[PDB]
Amino acid sequence: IDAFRLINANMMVLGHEPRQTTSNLGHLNKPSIQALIHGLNRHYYSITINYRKNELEQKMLLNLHKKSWMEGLTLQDYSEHCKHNESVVKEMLELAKNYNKAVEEEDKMTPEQLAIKNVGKQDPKRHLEEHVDVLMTSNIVQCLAAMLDTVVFK
Amino acid sequence: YAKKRGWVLGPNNYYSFASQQQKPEDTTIPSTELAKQVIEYARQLEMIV
């Protein structure tokens, strides 16, 4: 979204965009190439946009578009949760065997060059513990919500 | 032992009472401490950043 304003031709011997004592002109956009090919900057000029943004409209649009009350202690119970506990471990086994491969390799093939010529978003740390995080977050939030429902409901 | 304890000779028989416990167990009642025990796991993973 952008806003504009038509400039005169009477100031052809003077500075079009007659701007002055401020340093917030170089912000918000440099004049883009797809827009200065047209009447920028000799027919019209750009003008800055910020938003009259306030509380009681910010919070009612935050809290009402993304909210879940009774969902916060549901279970998604175990037939697909414990199934997903198989779904990650299996390739994590094979990716651990791939983690075995690079570490027992450990050759002086100029190892700062050996690490940089095989960046692949791959085994040793990238395709590692990322899975360990997902196994951790899924099982704790499952089991902690399970113990609370025993506590709360009788 | 008749005056200190029981063990009174009745009809040629000593009576020792049952010293048996009752064992009131649920053992899911470690639910608060088990929910507590999960919390310091995720705490010690995080919080050192």
From Swiss-Prot, chain A:
The modification Phosphothreonine is found at residue 110. It comes from the Eukaryota. This is 26S proteasome non-ATPase regulatory subunit 14. Belongs to the peptidase M67A family. PSMD14 subfamily. Widely expressed. Highest levels in heart and skeletal muscle. The chain holds residues 157 to 310 of 310 of the full protein. The modification Phosphoserine is found at residue 68. It comes from Homo sapiens (Human). Component of the 19S proteasome regulatory particle complex. The 26S proteasome consists of a 20S core particle (CP) and two 19S regulatory subunits (RP). The regulatory particle is made of a lid composed of 9 subunits including PSMD4, a base containing 6 ATPases and few additional components. Within the complex, PSMD4 interacts with subunit PSMD7 through their respective MPN domain. Interacts with TXNL1. Component of the 26S proteasome, a multiprotein complex involved in the ATP-dependent degradation of ubiquitinated proteins. This complex plays a key role in the maintenance of protein homeostasis by removing misfolded or damaged proteins, which could impair cellular functions, and by removing proteins whose functions are no longer required. Therefore, the proteasome participates in numerous cellular processes, including cell cycle progression, apoptosis, or DNA damage repair.
Curated annotation (Swiss-Prot), chain B:
Transmembrane segments: none annotated. Coiled coil: none annotated. It comes from the Eukaryota. Component of the 26S proteasome, a multiprotein complex involved in the ATP-dependent degradation of ubiquitinated proteins. This complex plays a key role in the maintenance of protein homeostasis by removing misfolded or damaged proteins, which could impair cellular functions, and by removing proteins whose functions are no longer required. Therefore, the proteasome participates in numerous cellular processes, including cell cycle progression, apoptosis, or DNA damage repair. Component of the 19S proteasome regulatory particle complex. The 26S proteasome consists of a 20S core particle (CP) and two 19S regulatory subunits (RP). The regulatory particle is made of a lid composed of 9 subunits including PSMD8, a base containing 6 ATPases and few additional components. Interacts with DDI2. Interacts with TASOR. Belongs to the proteasome subunit S14 family. This is 26S proteasome non-ATPase regulatory subunit 8. It comes from Homo sapiens. The chain holds residues 302 to 350 of 350 of the full protein.
